[PDB]
């Protein structure tokens, strides 16, 4: 069964650093374009950053650009997201989505309210 | 009551009786072998009885 | 807060118990039992008929139980009933909504149902006392597109939808007798057991479920795939079924041992299955693909043996006759071949 | 060196008939190729097949051996059939030109303008006017080869020569040229728009295609028809008949080439590989 | 065998009468252009329908029948029911260029529509829908596009830009930054088989169905030019 369980971090101060890990399993990791979506408390789902099958075509959302670094490790079936210079606007739960089909450049319907290939999430609360 | 529903379903499914995959494999193989004689696609039929 | 995590921990331990009960009853794989049987050959089917009257892509077809008449639906809003022996079209039913994603043919031959992105399942009366094809009912309880519909009587159609809900209807009064919930995503196709005492359903969450039709309750859940399941079909003896997903793999699940037996995958096929169906003996497993051509999988060894061809676009619908004579495959180029 | 004219005949008749039959067939037994512009291509391939089957061989012999091998009635049959099929091929070339004119300069109201029934009616009118032009001299070196010395005399009546060369080549030339001029203007405009609107963030193909079309048409049929107009106006002194023969052979060479100009799409190429 | 010959006769006599009406339907169905109109919840597609699970809106400009249809009945996942629309002339993608918080969502939806096996030949008509709200929001100054798009501090108005006479050099830079975001997603992968035709629209544009005519005519003319090996 396709499962993607994240293990990130908890409480950090503004400007802190944190590294989310998403051990994907139950499917061939190398064929799918992974993602990272987040849900800020009192808001909808938004997309943060993707990465292609190899780790060659990275992309980011504007707010996350320069601060977050998404990197996959196809050898151990895991997806990382290094977070630097954390701001209070980044408090959310970080789901490690993946993409519906393999060998595709479209990642369709990935921030849907009820989406099938997506983790339970980990809460990254940045405060003091 | 939500995780309650999910877990009661998952329990109900954890009660049925399972046979070995060897027995189910043998049953499927036996059905295919026993009906192999009336498969117009597997064994191609002569042009006389073929309506197409 | 804590009760949710506690029940989730219990559900995880219980899923581990289910997995350990399924891995204990894994004596030997089907490929080991079938290593001693003769191969199937090289099935070379040829296009015995080419049915051409549709304007736009053909999205689904269904055979009559006489193995002669079939119905097909295309996205121009036409539901045509062909005579597959003479390639004459008996009726041409002009739908109300173009976007028709499925169709069925009553297992007696009297009625025909369709229904697509308008969330309703229209039901058409073919043998009317005036000779005209009018709409008998419009089952309008679904919230989302309608991705399959299989008659079970002249009165009791069952229907799959794009809102994770299968719904058994009652064509007489027009309201759903039962509602089957439990899927997470779009549910894409269903297939009644030969006795119609239960059925299976494949959904866009990489899982299939076995539904008791009387008790209206999910009996078992089968999850071995890796992406959306686009097509499902029962083995001719109702004790197994084959799912075809978008991860480019068909699999043979069995309701009894509750596992996956075969995996019909190769290293060169990276296109996803759009249709499956068995042969009357249950040996040949047809499978329509996105690379525009069907295959014919020997469904006891997993070796391909046979390949169909001759379509311009993807193969959308594919159905073997009830007596095992022909295999009609429609495709998005609006031509419906018939093989043999 | 007439001995190698044998190889010319062999590679010409075979190419013409084989190519045009292959085109007619692949259009006939493929449901994808039966568009509303391929009925014109089928008319073209039919005209060119009739030419390469029963116009090229007799005129070929008459050119090589300066004496008509058939009889007087055979001469009349050959004359009428060549005047018919040459005009039919040129007129269906003009009709293909106007077809893709309407398809490119009126793209929205095209599939409702040129349907299958109006296409077939236009093809039928093309062949009807060609047959009318061909049967003109049956009704009614002055009367020299009409003394049956076992030669074949082309209809050198000056009015018929001017009318045949006008209705057969000079009016289709006009139409096809200004049609393809407009199509070239719009194709190059769209190319320059697209190429400016594609290279904002870090080739001539209409010229090649339209040039291939109008050039393989005019290199092969313009020599003969200016020669024919001269032979009419001036006479046998201005144009001797062997020149007219070689120049007609040029046009039959054009009918050899036509299966390659209007049948280059991947649909035709796939439907050909499916045939071979 | 007279009864069987009568069977076949009255079957052919019905197939003929059916294929007659079906050729009529083929004539009608090809003079009509279909246009999947999709956007977001706040985009404003409801107000470009200027006439169940679909809102068909027929309209006719210059005697050509257009047939546009919003798809509202279904839920949020659109990866399966969107394949139904691979034979439409254009895909009218309307987006509100004012709400920056939900502009990367439209960018990602456009990038998924563009790079899709079945929509890979469909060209998108891009409507940027709330130009007056965008003018207001960017002239106010409380909302900065460089908070959501960090590369707006190094952007320079296009030289080919046509700033409507009477507007600020800030509104024009703002408009064209978003238009160029969508256009760069377009040109990064679209290999001539489909195009993107961006527009700037208000909620009162009364000449907004002529701009679909002029863009579908161009889409289809480029389709013809491209199939004649002539582009
Ligand atoms: N009066 C005289 N005859 C001769 C002897 C002689 O060889 N005559 C002759 C010359 C050429 C041809 C080929 C005909 N090419 C016709 C061409 O296809 C065409 C013409 C009009 C419209 C469309 C097409 C046949 C016979 C000496 S003097």
XYZ file of N, CA, C and O in Angstrom, chain D residues 114-272:
636
model
N -16.493 23.406 -47.263
C -16.050 22.334 -48.147
C -16.333 21.032 -47.411
O -15.504 20.523 -46.658
N -17.518 20.482 -47.646
C -17.903 19.192 -47.097
C -17.528 18.091 -48.086
O -16.748 18.303 -49.015
N -18.068 16.887 -47.892
C -17.759 15.799 -48.812
C -18.601 15.885 -50.078
O -18.121 15.571 -51.171
N -19.853 16.319 -49.959
C -20.722 16.362 -51.127
C -20.315 17.474 -52.080
O -20.322 17.287 -53.302
N -19.939 18.635 -51.548
C -19.507 19.715 -52.424
C -18.135 19.427 -53.013
O -17.857 19.809 -54.153
N -17.284 18.725 -52.267
C -16.006 18.284 -52.812
C -16.202 17.332 -53.984
O -15.563 17.488 -55.031
N -17.070 16.331 -53.823
C -17.345 15.409 -54.919
C -17.979 16.125 -56.104
O -17.659 15.824 -57.257
N -18.875 17.075 -55.848
C -19.443 17.837 -56.951
C -18.381 18.635 -57.691
O -18.415 18.716 -58.923
N -17.427 19.224 -56.967
C -16.365 19.976 -57.628
C -15.466 19.061 -58.447
O -15.079 19.409 -59.567
N -15.109 17.897 -57.903
C -14.315 16.934 -58.663
C -15.040 16.534 -59.942
O -14.437 16.439 -61.022
N -16.346 16.295 -59.839
C -17.119 15.889 -61.004
C -17.165 17.009 -62.028
O -17.087 16.766 -63.233
N -17.271 18.255 -61.574
C -17.261 19.362 -62.524
C -15.904 19.490 -63.201
O -15.825 19.785 -64.399
N -14.826 19.283 -62.446
C -13.482 19.288 -63.021
C -13.395 18.292 -64.164
O -12.989 18.630 -65.282
N -13.790 17.045 -63.902
C -13.662 16.024 -64.935
C -14.651 16.233 -66.072
O -14.349 15.887 -67.215
N -15.811 16.829 -65.796
C -16.766 17.112 -66.860
C -16.219 18.171 -67.803
O -16.310 18.030 -69.026
N -15.639 19.246 -67.265
C -15.092 20.267 -68.155
C -13.860 19.744 -68.878
O -13.620 20.099 -70.039
N -13.074 18.874 -68.237
C -11.950 18.276 -68.948
C -12.432 17.419 -70.111
O -11.898 17.513 -71.222
N -13.451 16.589 -69.884
C -13.985 15.764 -70.960
C -14.623 16.608 -72.051
O -14.552 16.248 -73.229
N -15.250 17.725 -71.688
C -15.782 18.621 -72.705
C -14.665 19.188 -73.565
O -14.788 19.241 -74.792
N -13.569 19.618 -72.938
C -12.434 20.134 -73.697
C -11.849 19.048 -74.587
O -11.385 19.320 -75.700
N -11.882 17.798 -74.125
C -11.237 16.724 -74.870
C -12.025 16.329 -76.108
O -11.426 15.990 -77.133
N -13.351 16.351 -76.038
C -14.191 15.915 -77.144
C -14.528 17.042 -78.106
O -15.387 16.866 -78.973
N -13.878 18.192 -77.969
C -14.128 19.293 -78.896
C -13.704 18.983 -80.328
O -14.482 19.283 -81.250
N -12.529 18.406 -80.602
C -12.105 18.250 -81.994
C -12.774 17.105 -82.734
O -12.657 17.043 -83.963
N -13.458 16.197 -82.036
C -14.171 15.126 -82.726
C -15.238 15.715 -83.638
O -15.363 15.328 -84.805
N -16.006 16.670 -83.129
C -16.875 17.446 -83.995
C -16.029 18.240 -84.982
O -14.957 18.744 -84.634
N -16.509 18.333 -86.219
C -15.801 19.038 -87.288
C -14.383 18.511 -87.482
O -13.518 19.211 -88.006
N 1.504 21.486 -92.590
C 0.935 20.145 -92.601
C -0.576 20.201 -92.427
O -1.143 19.491 -91.597
N -1.221 21.059 -93.212
C -2.673 21.147 -93.185
C -3.274 19.867 -93.748
O -2.979 19.482 -94.884
N -4.121 19.217 -92.946
C -4.711 17.903 -93.239
C -3.709 16.979 -93.928
O -3.971 16.395 -94.981
N -2.536 16.851 -93.309
C -1.464 16.003 -93.815
C -1.474 14.612 -93.195
O -1.600 13.618 -93.913
N -1.341 14.520 -91.869
C -1.460 13.234 -91.190
C -2.886 12.715 -91.126
O -3.085 11.558 -90.740
N -3.875 13.525 -91.483
C -5.241 13.044 -91.600
C -5.510 12.402 -92.955
O -6.658 12.058 -93.250
N -4.476 12.242 -93.779
C -4.514 11.373 -94.946
C -4.080 9.954 -94.612
O -3.817 9.163 -95.524
N -4.005 9.622 -93.325
C -3.584 8.330 -92.798
C -2.283 7.834 -93.422
O -2.283 6.805 -94.110
N -1.161 8.525 -93.214
C 0.137 7.939 -93.567
C 0.679 7.077 -92.440
O 1.881 6.797 -92.392
N -0.208 6.685 -91.520
C 0.140 5.956 -90.296
C 0.915 6.841 -89.320
O 1.880 6.407 -88.688
N 0.480 8.090 -89.192
C 0.938 9.018 -88.168
C -0.257 9.572 -87.400
O -1.411 9.430 -87.808
N 0.035 10.208 -86.269
C -0.985 10.781 -85.402
C -0.797 12.287 -85.346
O 0.290 12.765 -85.014
N -1.853 13.028 -85.668
C -1.803 14.481 -85.771
C -2.538 15.104 -84.594
O -3.738 14.875 -84.419
N -1.825 15.895 -83.795
C -2.480 16.634 -82.727
C -3.380 17.708 -83.319
O -3.129 18.228 -84.408
N -4.432 18.051 -82.585
C -5.441 18.971 -83.101
C -4.835 20.363 -83.182
O -4.857 21.127 -82.217
N -4.296 20.704 -84.350
C -3.556 21.941 -84.535
C -4.431 23.083 -85.036
O -3.903 24.132 -85.417
N -5.749 22.901 -85.055
C -6.635 24.020 -85.335
C -6.374 25.125 -84.323
O -6.529 24.924 -83.116
N -5.958 26.284 -84.820
C -5.433 27.355 -83.977
C -6.441 27.763 -82.906
O -6.053 27.881 -81.734
N -7.720 27.993 -83.228
C -8.673 28.299 -82.151
C -8.737 27.223 -81.086
O -8.735 27.548 -79.891
N -8.775 25.949 -81.473
C -8.788 24.900 -80.464
C -7.489 24.863 -79.682
O -7.504 24.559 -78.490
N -6.361 25.172 -80.320
C -5.102 25.182 -79.587
C -5.102 26.267 -78.518
O -4.718 26.016 -77.368
N -5.556 27.471 -78.869
C -5.602 28.545 -77.884
C -6.593 28.239 -76.773
O -6.299 28.472 -75.597
N -7.761 27.689 -77.114
C -8.755 27.402 -76.084
C -8.314 26.257 -75.180
O -8.537 26.303 -73.966
N -7.670 25.232 -75.739
C -7.199 24.132 -74.911
C -6.072 24.580 -73.999
O -6.072 24.252 -72.810
N -5.105 25.338 -74.524
C -4.013 25.799 -73.678
C -4.469 26.835 -72.660
O -3.858 26.943 -71.593
N -5.527 27.590 -72.953
C -6.075 28.509 -71.966
C -6.811 27.766 -70.861
O -6.429 27.843 -69.691
N -7.867 27.032 -71.213
C -8.683 26.377 -70.198
C -7.888 25.293 -69.483
O -8.248 24.863 -68.384
N -6.780 24.849 -70.072
C -6.090 23.703 -69.500
C -4.923 24.118 -68.622
O -4.653 23.465 -67.612
N -4.206 25.160 -68.986
C -3.029 25.459 -68.178
C -2.940 26.903 -67.716
O -2.494 27.149 -66.598
N -3.347 27.862 -68.541
C -3.080 29.252 -68.206
C -4.070 29.816 -67.198
O -3.719 30.730 -66.449
N -5.290 29.309 -67.155
C -6.211 29.783 -66.129
C -5.950 29.091 -64.792
O -5.926 29.767 -63.753
N -5.758 27.768 -64.754
C -5.293 27.155 -63.506
C -3.988 27.724 -63.007
O -3.788 27.797 -61.792
N -3.089 28.147 -63.893
C -1.875 28.800 -63.426
C -2.206 30.084 -62.684
O -1.724 30.310 -61.573
N -3.028 30.941 -63.288
C -3.438 32.171 -62.621
C -4.020 31.881 -61.246
O -3.569 32.438 -60.234
N -5.034 31.015 -61.196
C -5.737 30.764 -59.945
C -4.788 30.193 -58.904
O -4.716 30.687 -57.774
N -4.060 29.139 -59.261
C -3.157 28.489 -58.326
C -2.070 29.436 -57.842
O -1.708 29.409 -56.661
N -1.586 30.330 -58.706
C -0.548 31.262 -58.285
C -1.072 32.304 -57.316
O -0.428 32.562 -56.298
N -2.220 32.932 -57.585
C -2.593 33.951 -56.604
C -3.116 33.321 -55.314
O -2.874 33.859 -54.222
N -3.772 32.166 -55.403
C -4.146 31.432 -54.201
C -2.919 31.129 -53.351
O -2.897 31.395 -52.143
N -1.877 30.566 -53.958
C -0.715 30.216 -53.163
C 0.081 31.433 -52.737
O 0.779 31.370 -51.727
N -0.038 32.550 -53.449
C 0.563 33.783 -52.965
C -0.064 34.200 -51.647
O 0.643 34.487 -50.675
N -1.395 34.231 -51.594
C -2.058 34.593 -50.345
C -1.732 33.604 -49.230
O -1.508 34.005 -48.078
N -1.682 32.312 -49.548
C -1.365 31.332 -48.514
C 0.068 31.505 -48.027
O 0.357 31.314 -46.842
N 0.981 31.920 -48.908
C 2.356 32.159 -48.475
C 2.449 33.390 -47.589
O 3.169 33.386 -46.584
N 1.744 34.459 -47.956
C 1.694 35.636 -47.097
C 1.235 35.273 -45.692
O 1.902 35.611 -44.704
N 0.112 34.560 -45.575
C -0.390 34.286 -44.230
C 0.508 33.294 -43.499
O 0.702 33.411 -42.284
N 1.103 32.331 -44.204
C 1.960 31.371 -43.522
C 3.217 32.028 -42.979
O 3.639 31.733 -41.854
N 3.812 32.948 -43.740
C 4.997 33.638 -43.245
C 4.660 34.628 -42.139
O 5.446 34.787 -41.194
N 3.507 35.296 -42.221
C 3.096 36.157 -41.119
C 2.966 35.366 -39.825
O 3.488 35.771 -38.776
N 2.253 34.242 -39.872
C 2.115 33.434 -38.671
C 3.458 32.911 -38.185
O 3.679 32.825 -36.975
N 4.372 32.575 -39.096
C 5.679 32.104 -38.650
C 6.438 33.190 -37.905
O 7.050 32.920 -36.869
N 6.416 34.424 -38.408
C 7.172 35.467 -37.723
C 6.533 35.843 -36.390
O 7.253 36.066 -35.408
N 5.195 35.891 -36.323
C 4.537 36.078 -35.030
C 4.960 35.007 -34.040
O 5.391 35.317 -32.927
N 4.850 33.739 -34.434
C 5.172 32.636 -33.539
C 6.634 32.661 -33.113
O 6.955 32.368 -31.955
N 7.538 33.017 -34.025
C 8.951 33.010 -33.680
C 9.350 34.198 -32.825
O 10.349 34.110 -32.106
N 8.612 35.309 -32.878
C 8.870 36.361 -31.901
C 8.269 35.991 -30.552
O 8.848 36.288 -29.502
N 7.118 35.318 -30.561
C 6.420 34.934 -29.342
C 6.835 33.571 -28.826
O 6.088 32.957 -28.060
N 7.986 33.062 -29.253
C 8.556 31.871 -28.647
C 9.954 32.086 -28.097
O 10.363 31.346 -27.201
N 10.682 33.088 -28.578
C 12.027 33.343 -28.108
C 12.134 34.568 -27.225
O 13.076 35.353 -27.360
N 11.164 34.754 -26.331
C 11.195 35.834 -25.354
C 11.913 35.466 -24.065
O 12.261 36.367 -23.295
N 12.153 34.182 -23.810
C 12.798 33.756 -22.580
C 13.925 32.779 -22.889
O 13.757 31.883 -23.723
N 15.090 32.927 -22.234
C 16.224 32.009 -22.416
C 15.968 30.614 -21.845
O 15.042 30.437 -21.053
N 11.915 28.415 -39.100
C 12.604 28.531 -40.378
C 11.614 28.523 -41.532
O 10.457 28.149 -41.366
N 12.081 28.952 -42.701
C 11.267 28.934 -43.910
C 10.819 27.514 -44.228
O 11.639 26.654 -44.562
N 9.517 27.270 -44.122
C 8.945 25.966 -44.421
C 7.766 26.143 -45.363
O 7.447 25.247 -46.146
N 7.114 27.303 -45.294
C 6.104 27.633 -46.287
C 6.741 27.943 -47.623
O 6.164 27.634 -48.670
N 7.929 28.542 -47.608
C 8.657 28.754 -48.850
C 9.000 27.428 -49.502
O 8.719 27.224 -50.683
N 9.582 26.503 -48.739
C 9.956 25.211 -49.302
C 8.754 24.482 -49.884
O 8.804 24.017 -51.024
N 7.658 24.392 -49.131
C 6.511 23.610 -49.581
C 5.809 24.267 -50.763
O 5.523 23.608 -51.770
N 5.507 25.559 -50.664
C 4.835 26.207 -51.781
C 5.724 26.258 -53.011
O 5.223 26.179 -54.140
N 7.039 26.359 -52.824
C 7.935 26.330 -53.959
C 7.977 24.968 -54.607
O 7.919 24.861 -55.827
N 8.074 23.908 -53.805
C 7.992 22.560 -54.352
C 6.723 22.382 -55.168
O 6.771 21.887 -56.297
N 5.590 22.843 -54.644
C 4.316 22.656 -55.332
C 4.301 23.409 -56.658
O 4.206 22.806 -57.736
N 4.418 24.737 -56.606
C 4.288 25.510 -57.835
C 5.438 25.230 -58.797
O 5.253 25.306 -60.015
N 6.606 24.839 -58.297
C 7.742 24.571 -59.142
C 7.637 23.246 -59.852
O 7.874 23.189 -61.059
N 7.297 22.164 -59.147
C 7.060 20.931 -59.880
C 5.853 21.036 -60.786
O 5.711 20.209 -61.688
N 4.976 22.016 -60.578
C 3.910 22.189 -61.553
C 4.406 22.919 -62.792
O 4.145 22.486 -63.917
N 5.125 24.022 -62.611
C 5.453 24.896 -63.727
C 6.690 24.469 -64.498
O 6.779 24.762 -65.692
N 7.646 23.789 -63.866
C 8.826 23.350 -64.598
C 8.470 22.318 -65.649
O 9.148 22.217 -66.676
N 7.405 21.560 -65.418
C 7.028 20.437 -66.259
C 5.946 20.778 -67.269
O 5.910 20.185 -68.347
N 5.059 21.715 -66.955
C 3.942 21.995 -67.840
C 4.003 23.358 -68.509
O 3.280 23.573 -69.485
N 4.821 24.279 -68.025
C 4.883 25.589 -68.662
C 5.676 25.540 -69.963
O 5.251 26.156 -70.953
N 6.826 24.847 -70.014
C 7.502 24.690 -71.311
C 6.579 24.208 -72.414
O 6.483 24.857 -73.466
N 5.889 23.084 -72.207
C 5.068 22.571 -73.289
C 3.983 23.547 -73.688
O 3.657 23.645 -74.870
N 3.393 24.264 -72.740
C 2.216 25.035 -73.110
C 2.602 26.347 -73.772
O 1.898 26.819 -74.674
N 3.752 26.920 -73.405
C 4.215 28.045 -74.207
C 4.620 27.561 -75.593
O 4.362 28.243 -76.595
N 5.220 26.369 -75.687
C 5.547 25.811 -76.997
C 4.295 25.619 -77.835
O 4.295 25.883 -79.039
N 3.222 25.145 -77.211
C 1.985 24.879 -77.931
C 1.346 26.174 -78.406
O 0.858 26.261 -79.538
N 1.342 27.198 -77.550
C 0.836 28.497 -77.978
C 1.643 29.025 -79.152
O 1.082 29.597 -80.096
N 2.963 28.828 -79.134
C 3.788 29.292 -80.245
C 3.475 28.516 -81.522
O 3.218 29.108 -82.575
N 3.486 27.186 -81.438
C 3.158 26.298 -82.548
C 1.823 26.672 -83.173
O 1.662 26.607 -84.395
N 0.858 27.054 -82.343
C -0.400 27.549 -82.880
C -0.195 28.868 -83.607
O -0.484 28.979 -84.800
N 0.328 29.875 -82.909
C 0.452 31.196 -83.513
C 1.415 31.169 -84.693
O 1.031 31.460 -85.831
N 2.668 30.807 -84.445
C 3.650 30.783 -85.509
C 3.413 29.679 -86.515
O 3.052 29.945 -87.665
N 3.598 28.433 -86.091
C 3.383 27.299 -86.956
C 4.449 26.238 -86.788
O 5.251 26.271 -85.852
N 4.476 25.269 -87.707
C 5.500 24.218 -87.631
C 6.909 24.743 -87.805
O 7.863 24.051 -87.433
N 7.067 25.941 -88.367
C 8.389 26.543 -88.472
C 8.863 27.066 -87.123
O 10.042 26.927 -86.777
N 7.962 27.666 -86.346
C 8.341 28.161 -85.029
C 8.536 27.014 -84.044
O 9.468 27.035 -83.231
N 7.664 26.010 -84.093
C 7.789 24.843 -83.221
C 7.640 23.567 -84.042
O 6.544 23.279 -84.541
N 8.694 22.781 -84.210
C 8.547 21.484 -84.872
C 8.012 20.430 -83.917
O 8.272 20.454 -82.713
N 7.265 19.486 -84.487
C 6.547 18.509 -83.673
C 7.411 17.694 -82.708
O 6.888 17.335 -81.639
N 8.673 17.351 -82.994
C 9.450 16.625 -81.975
C 9.658 17.427 -80.705
O 9.720 16.844 -79.612
N 9.752 18.754 -80.816
C 9.803 19.588 -79.623
C 8.525 19.453 -78.811
O 8.575 19.279 -77.589
N 7.370 19.528 -79.474
C 6.105 19.350 -78.775
C 6.028 17.982 -78.117
O 5.473 17.844 -77.022
N 6.601 16.963 -78.753
C 6.559 15.624 -78.171
C 7.399 15.544 -76.903
O 6.930 15.052 -75.868
N 8.643 16.017 -76.963
C 9.478 16.006 -75.767
C 8.854 16.842 -74.654
O 8.905 16.472 -73.472
N 8.226 17.958 -75.012
C 7.651 18.816 -73.991
C 6.386 18.228 -73.380
O 6.127 18.461 -72.196
N 5.590 17.473 -74.145
C 4.506 16.718 -73.527
C 5.049 15.643 -72.605
O 4.453 15.345 -71.560
N 6.153 15.015 -72.999
C 6.761 14.023 -72.126
C 7.194 14.653 -70.811
O 7.154 14.000 -69.763
N 7.582 15.927 -70.844
C 7.819 16.653 -69.598
C 6.578 16.667 -68.702
O 6.674 16.415 -67.492
N 5.406 16.948 -69.268
C 4.198 16.963 -68.457
C 3.849 15.599 -67.896
O 3.402 15.474 -66.750
N 4.031 14.558 -68.697
C 3.789 13.223 -68.163
C 4.780 12.900 -67.049
O 4.438 12.199 -66.084
N 5.995 13.443 -67.131
C 6.910 13.331 -66.003
C 6.337 14.015 -64.768
O 6.476 13.510 -63.652
N 5.692 15.169 -64.949
C 5.030 15.825 -63.816
C 3.996 14.914 -63.175
O 3.881 14.852 -61.940
N 3.191 14.254 -64.003
C 2.206 13.317 -63.471
C 2.882 12.149 -62.772
O 2.270 11.487 -61.931
N 4.138 11.871 -63.115
C 4.897 10.883 -62.352
C 5.230 11.400 -60.957
O 5.282 10.627 -59.994
N 5.462 12.709 -60.829
C 5.956 13.259 -59.568
C 4.824 13.535 -58.590
O 5.020 13.455 -57.373
N 3.643 13.875 -59.102
C 2.517 14.310 -58.272
C 2.213 13.453 -57.042
O 1.845 14.012 -56.003
N 2.327 12.121 -57.085
C 2.124 11.331 -55.861
C 3.084 11.646 -54.727
O 2.869 11.154 -53.616
N 4.136 12.430 -54.963
C 5.105 12.744 -53.923
C 4.900 14.118 -53.312
O 5.373 14.360 -52.199
N 4.215 15.014 -54.012
C 4.032 16.382 -53.550
C 2.838 16.497 -52.616
O 2.914 17.140 -51.567
N 1.723 15.868 -52.968
C 0.483 16.016 -52.226
C 0.187 14.839 -51.311
O -0.949 14.701 -50.854
N 1.164 13.984 -51.039
C 0.958 12.806 -50.208
C 2.131 12.606 -49.262
O 2.637 11.499 -49.084
N 2.574 13.687 -48.629
C 3.750 13.655 -47.773
C 3.424 13.652 -46.286
O 4.339 13.510 -45.470
N 2.159 13.809 -45.912
C 1.797 13.888 -44.511
C 2.128 12.581 -43.797
O 2.263 11.533 -44.430
N 2.289 12.623 -42.469
C 2.504 11.376 -41.721
C 1.314 10.444 -41.759
O 1.483 9.240 -41.536
N 0.115 10.960 -42.030
C -1.043 10.093 -42.209
C -0.896 9.243 -43.465
O -1.082 8.021 -43.422
N -0.554 9.871 -44.595
C -0.267 9.101 -45.801
C 0.926 8.181 -45.609
O 0.915 7.046 -46.083
N 1.976 8.652 -44.942
C 3.162 7.814 -44.802
C 2.876 6.599 -43.925
O 3.322 5.483 -44.226
N 2.110 6.787 -42.850
C 1.709 5.650 -42.033
C 0.795 4.710 -42.805
O 0.939 3.486 -42.719
N -0.149 5.257 -43.572
C -1.043 4.413 -44.353
C -0.340 3.749 -45.527
O -0.892 2.816 -46.114
N 0.844 4.224 -45.899
C 1.630 3.540 -46.915
C 2.445 2.420 -46.299
O 2.500 1.316 -46.848
